[PDB]
Write a protein that binds this DNA or RNA. Structure first.
Length: 174
RNA sequence: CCUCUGGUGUACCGGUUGUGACGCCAGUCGCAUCGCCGGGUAGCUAUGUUCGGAAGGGAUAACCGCUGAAAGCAUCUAAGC
């Protein structure tokens, strides 16, 4: 359980407060919440944080490791946040951002308007690239996946919506 | 369901054959598959008319995922979604 053994350090501004099972993290970007499992327990000494099993059970160890990973991700999100920089590749494929709704022309008869969930932001340096920024890694990844679902990449020519840091399998007809 | 198009419609109207009768003519009636033939009001009816199988919401199958440890990596999963 090396991940669980490895502790996490508060940056400075963000503050973590535990009431009951619920745990709240307040930061410059925003406020986030988490639910602790029964077996794992948390102790905050200095800016350092420690999570350990209540019992030596392997279930408790794995839950403590998962809690450590989640809390580290939450701390990173509140301190800085994350960006996903999705990209669209094709001919005639375009995108734009207006308010909280992103309008995409992806080769279908009708343009697709996607309403971003609260807590995420989108900007468009170019019609072929969208930058999605958020403090919640899980929600941000979910939104990115939903957007890419509309037109995921196709193998023969690579047309569609692709993550830049993704390997596209390529195939040739006949 | 019967406004329209039709069918039927032996208590509605008419044309006509044989015979009998009402004293006779004229005019009528009975019987002959409603004697036979031509139409036909309401009602019932289809082949006639109108309408319907919508659109939505929740959970979910195969499948596709997000984040994530066991197992420093990886992983749709054991937590969560």
């Amino acid at each position: 359980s090396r991940v669980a053994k490895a502790p996490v350090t508060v940056p400075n501004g963000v503050t973590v407060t535990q009431n009951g099972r619920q745990v709240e993290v307040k930061g410059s970007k925003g406020t986030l919440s988490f639910n602790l499992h029964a077996l794992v327990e948390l102790k905050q000494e200095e800016g350092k944080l420690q999570l350990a099993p209540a019992k030596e059970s392997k279930d408790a160890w794995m839950q403590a490791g998962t809690a450590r990973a989640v809390l580290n991700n939450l701390v990173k999100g509140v301190s800085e946040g994350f960006e996903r920089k999705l990209q669209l590749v094709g001919v005639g494929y375009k995108a734009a951002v207006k308010g909280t709704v992103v309008n995409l022309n992806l080769g279908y008869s009708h343009p697709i308007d996607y309403a971003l969930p609260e807590g995420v932001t989108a900007e468009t340096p170019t019609a072929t690239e969208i930058i999605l920024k958020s403090a919640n890694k899980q929600l941000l990844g979910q939104v990115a996946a939903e957007i890419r679902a509309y037109r995921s990449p196709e193998p023969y020519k690579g047309k569609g919506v692709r993550y830049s840091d993704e390997v596209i399998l390529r195939k040739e007809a006949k």
